[PDB]
Design a binder for these strands. Structure first.
Lengths: 50, 99
RNA sequence: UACUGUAAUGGACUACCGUGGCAGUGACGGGUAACGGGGAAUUAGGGUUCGAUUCCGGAGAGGGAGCCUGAGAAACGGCUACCACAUCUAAGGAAGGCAGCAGGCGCGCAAAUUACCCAAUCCUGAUUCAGGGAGGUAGUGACAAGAAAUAACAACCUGGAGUGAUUGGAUGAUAGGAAUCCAAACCCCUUUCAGAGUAACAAUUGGAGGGCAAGUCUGGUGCCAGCAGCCGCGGUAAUUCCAGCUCCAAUAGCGUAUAUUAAAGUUGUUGCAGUUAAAAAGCUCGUAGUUGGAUUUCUGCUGGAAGGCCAAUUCUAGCAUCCUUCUGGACUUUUACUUUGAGAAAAUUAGAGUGUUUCAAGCAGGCUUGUCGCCUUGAAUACUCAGCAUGGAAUAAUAAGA
RNA sequence: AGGUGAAAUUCUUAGAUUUGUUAAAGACGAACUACUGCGAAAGCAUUUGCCAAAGAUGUUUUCAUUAAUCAAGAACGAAAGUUAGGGGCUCGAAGACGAUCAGAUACCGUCGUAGUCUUAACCAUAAACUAUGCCGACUAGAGAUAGGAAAACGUCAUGACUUCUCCUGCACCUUAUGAGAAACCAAAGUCUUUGGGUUCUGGGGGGAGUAUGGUCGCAAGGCUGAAACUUAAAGGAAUUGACGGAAGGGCACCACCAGGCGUGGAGCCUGCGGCUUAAUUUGACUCAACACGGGGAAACUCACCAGGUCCAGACAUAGGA
RNA sequence: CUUUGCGUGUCUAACGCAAGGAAGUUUGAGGCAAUAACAGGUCUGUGAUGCCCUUAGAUGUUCUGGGCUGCACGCGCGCUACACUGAUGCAUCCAACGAGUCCUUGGCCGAUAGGUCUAGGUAAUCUUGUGAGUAUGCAUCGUGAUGGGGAUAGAUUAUUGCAAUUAUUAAUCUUCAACGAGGAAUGCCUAGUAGGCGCAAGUCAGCACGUUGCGCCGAUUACGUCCCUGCCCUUUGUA
RNA sequence: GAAGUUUUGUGAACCUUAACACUUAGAGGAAGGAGAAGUCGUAACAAGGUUUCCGUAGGUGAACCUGCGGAAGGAUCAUU
């Protein structure tokens, strides 16, 4: 490859994109209580967008 | 892949055959793989020979035939349309057409 | 052959004398990011790679060499010398060896406290008493192995048991005692006064085109920035980039890099392939090497000891012309092979027994108002080519040919 | 005359090329010549004689395991090439001109040295091919064929031919519940129902049969033979299309034939490039763009350009009135 | 019906030739048109439409004026030509397709165009039997770019429109070029066809040298072929 | 029984020469692959327009060409 490719544009799209904060939501359960929820909602695709 | 089981030269238990030059091309091919048509034919066609039967001395005369053994090159034959070319099935037949 | 020397045997060494010794089954030499083994990782069998490191040998104390004392050292926490580093000097000289325990510099991707004590385990001594950075205890510690919090249950919309922060009342993380532990602290195990309602005491790490489980979602970017282990995304509508939301996988862990093992029947003894895909020497002779045709006491009946099971299967004596020298071994050509047996350290590995609360572990425990406590208590056993021994009729070498 | 697709270089009245009879020279053995023979392979075609050698067949001969396969090591090994003598007809790498072509150091043509042939050494490789290692066993038939052997009151004159069996050769056809990726295969079968014996070789494609070292060679080169870096495919066998200055068929005046009438030339009309301009709106560019967009545009059409208007901005919320 | 006759063929499918007949190539000439497609063309045919653009200082809309027609020069479809089988002036007499709420007879005025006053027609009725032109008959012209050729250019008279200048056309007089059968290339076409000669309709207030139909006069030469340029089906080779 | 001393052996260390091993500079020469697009041909794939290919030899800007002997992996499994 050619050495003299320019390094001006480096960090274009990281700097370009619009910032936005994460929403505050109530916490999920963890460990055993998580595996309880995953068991139930299947047996009574998984991600289906509009 | 083998296009012919034979290889087209028809040689078994030699290692070396005789050679002949093609009558048209010039090329050294092997005698076995040459392709040969022994053309017997009378000298003056068929239509034109009745002039000789009219004109000649002697009561009847057999117009003596011309005997030559032609030998060909493959490439000289296929150009000149002695053999042309055949299908994969009908390739295998070795009989005389025009007995 | 004969000295010499040694603790003794030896070309170990010295005189003379002979011309041998090793090698195509790999001598001699080179490489090792090589101390050897007991072992470790690796999920059929066969294997492949690792073993500096808990035990047993070996070698070394900066590099080589020499030596005293002693039962024992070619010793280095003993000495002498040179070489290489380096300390103090009043400049004449003197002293130094952390590949012991901490600690520091330097090399590096890469590694802990200049701590307390002989109480346990053992050792040394003139020894019941002294000493021990051997050794043990604590600190640092997501190198690693084991167990398992982050919620559970009620009444009060989908109705064919799940949701719904709608309120509702029912154990240790933590902080400090008590006793216990400890050589002295500390941790564990007990029991204690406080100690959760967005259980703010808030789980993260990688992904969501295929392989690979999981979105033809919504903004920004426009072969740019970047992703991408491989195939491939991005050139203005991106199922892969940069974000948000939702969902998936594993979970107190998860991703990455290098080496290695399986997958690899892609090193093939078990077990590959060689007409055209990678690959049959152009062709014959040929020495080792490897492999070699058939054939030499087979059949039958009568016992004997065992034996599984509602006579089979083992082993063994006789009789069809079958030794003897004696009172168990000598002869049967010789081995390999197979069988049983000896001897071979434990740890590790498999494994018998046992509620360390389970478990990884550990080698302990278990009964019981009885007291010289009992279970004449347990901690089994296997495993460890060549070598030694032995029963045997085949197979295969090998020997031979009174 | 030669020669070619067509011509030229070349040879020719100091008589070529063609006709005939000789003589010399050195090559090469036509037709017969075959899905025939012999040979370890390379290879070997005229007659006759001499010299050894080999297979198969036949054998109520003989020895009695003497065998198979082979690291080292050894013999032969086409063509080209080399070295030293002979021989040198034809052909003919190089070279020379003459053509062809844009050029043509090539194909085509005319001369033409090494070489081709032989004795004496070397060399040691070929698509040296059956691209299938060598011994052995067993698998399936039919008809040919070469060699030998036995039989038949066989047919014609010791032999040729007919009919039938046996081994040993080169093969061939047919077929498989045998194999294979398939092409194909009596071996490539008897191999996941995996072990008769043994030699050599291979592990994605390049780099590379290169570098260096070794060893053989008079040289040319042979045998042995790496790495760095590079790359996601190289490769095999068949299938479907399209293409072929390959074959065999059938077709068309959007193709020729035989013709007829034209365009291309002239001026003019009209479309498209461009060049121009404030604007000369814009699509389509081989047949299948270009008197085409039903496009013969004064304004309108109108997309273009320099200017000027109107809101013909529903409705929701709201000030202002 | 290829009927009949004779040939041609496994005489099966069907060909050729002759006679008959209005007609014997499927009787001639068209419409209709499969499966696959091509990144063919059309967002400028649309109230067929996603997305993007812009939305009042407009790319919406509409009004005045210009432009699409602007010319150192290439290329493509057409028209009229180069003459005497002709041009010109007189006379003779023949078509079919249309089309009109505008198509236009009849009478007067005017060289012409055209105008003016009546008049028939919702059309087999009226224009119209559309007296079309190549053609025919009788004269002058004489091979001269001439009277062939009618571009280029000045001046005048009418017509459509609200407006004619870059001249919408139609007339009248002049002005009188190139071109003497078209270089290399290459198009269309087999019988009422080619070619020539007009006419009508479409777009249209006005304008055809254009297209789509219609007749009239009416030949030459094949009735085969795979050489060129393409096409269809087999066997064959492919990197 | 000290210092000193004689001759032996054990023998560190340093130096000369040589060889072997392993890193490493070098004017110039001449490979391979990578770019990402250039210049000149047209060699191969169809009978690729001179069939393709092998061994060896010579020649030429370059692919390549021609001589001699082979092979079908050919464009022929085939005719007294």
């Amino acid at each position: 490859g050619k050495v003299h490719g320019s390094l001006a544009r480096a960090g274009k799209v990281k700097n370009q994109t619009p910032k936005v904060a994460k929403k505050e939501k109530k916490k999920p359960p963890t460990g055993r209580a998580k595996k309880r929820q995953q068991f139930n909602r299947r047996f009574t695709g998984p991600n289906a967008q509009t | 892949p083998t296009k012919r089981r034979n290889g087209g030269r028809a040689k078994h238990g030699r290692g070396h055959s005789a050679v002949v030059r093609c009558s048209n091309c010039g090329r050294s091919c092997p005698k076995d793989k040459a392709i040969k048509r022994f053309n017997v034919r009378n000298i003056v066609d068929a239509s034109s020979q009745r002039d000789l039967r009219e004109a000649s001395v002697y009561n009847t005369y057999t117009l003596p035939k011309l005997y030559i053994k032609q030998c060909y090159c493959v490439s000289c034959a296929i150009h000149s349309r002695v053999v042309r070319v055949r299908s994969v099935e009908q390739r295998k037949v070795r009989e005389n057409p025009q007995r």
